[PDB]
Amino acid sequence: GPLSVAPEMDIMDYCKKEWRGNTQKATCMKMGYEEVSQKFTSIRRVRGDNYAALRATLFQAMSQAVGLPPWLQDPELMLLPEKLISKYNWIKQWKLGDLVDKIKESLTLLRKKWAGLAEMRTAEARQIACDELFTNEAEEYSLYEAVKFLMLNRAIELYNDKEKGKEVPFFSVLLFARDTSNDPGQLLRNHLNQVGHTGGLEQVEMFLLAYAVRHTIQVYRLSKYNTEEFITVYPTDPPKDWPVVTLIAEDDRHYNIPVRVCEETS
Amino acid sequence: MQIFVKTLTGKTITLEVEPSDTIENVKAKIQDKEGIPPDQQRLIFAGKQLEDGRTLSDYNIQKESTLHLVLRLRGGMQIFVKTLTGKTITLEVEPSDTIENVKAKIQDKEGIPPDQQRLIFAGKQLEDGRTLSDYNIQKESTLHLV
């Protein structure tokens, strides 16, 4: 029974256990962790079940939750599944990890859980409650269905805007230039359905995740140590008002969570 | 002539190329400079995914043209490997990763030489040139080291 978000461990102790080889790559990983350790004290290992990008981002977003974001507060959000599925029947090709009711229940849960965290009186109580939330398997995976649906919705908006000659974030031009992702239908069948199952997110889909939940995602990419990509931000130039969450990716294949002293369980 | 290749980080790579160079050539240059395997690379220009066998001229790419690099590498997968000692190690991997790449990672993490490594999944010895997906090794599968 893998833990969703493992208990925090001292970051250099974690590094030491994980990278023991006498090789340039191990040395690079250790140097990367050293630099991360200047700003973060601990690491929580995130479960690598192909939901990791969503789990890590959402855990960080919700565990820091001081307000319910307006986009999540909006009543219209609850009308979205019926609005979209009625309009685009191909959305019924959604693979679950009826449809309108199931997605709606997921979005309702996301809103309710996030609001419950935001309404707590102390940051400590919020952190503890968020930890417990990510030990309820069923509820947790429902949250990721909500997030995947928000990614699909945002992709539809950007696609339709782009097709009308309207201004769009540039990543969306690249997202839909991919041969397996030329339209929202292909994005769903070839990329999103696989999320949490047989495949995770590409870098261009990290942008889409950031826009879906309106959080800026800062990633320490240890493999890019000593280059300008060592700290990579999704999206590159985000709205100033989006909260920032930080992840670590050793070599672009999985995302764990770095933790500040002021974020510690103890 | 000079062309630019921009990543989804706005990092810009400058390449010296010729009009008759192919997209395959360009990916090879990107591998040389960035260490990115050609099979992970997509190059996009004017909203089109460029094909390996066509030339820059074929795509009207000229001096100062900017291509965009959009990688296929996905994040979010772990597998487990049990060593000859009995220790369990956790690797961060991609379904397209080769067995050879996995053995190299075991060396980086544990110091075990790839030449000494025999990996088993579902009774099968795994061949170096094949990918995790070729063997239907999924997230949180366990491989055995002998």
From TrEMBL, chain B:
GO cellular component terms given for this protein: mitochondrial outer membrane; nucleus
One Pfam family per UniProt: ubiquitin
Domain Ubiquitin-like: 1-76, 77-146
Intracellular or extracellular location(s): Cytoplasm; Mitochondrion outer membrane; Nucleus
Superkingdom assignment: Eukaryota
Keyword Nucleus: yes
Main location: cytoplasm
Entry membrane topology: Peripheral membrane protein
Keyword Iron-sulfur: no
Record's keyword terms, sorted: ADP-ribosylation, Cytoplasm, Isopeptide bond, Membrane, Mitochondrion, Mitochondrion outer membrane, Nucleus, Ubl conjugation
Family: Belongs to the ubiquitin family.
Protein's recorded name: Ubiquitin C
Source organism per UniProt: Homo sapiens (Human)
Gene expressing this chain: UBC
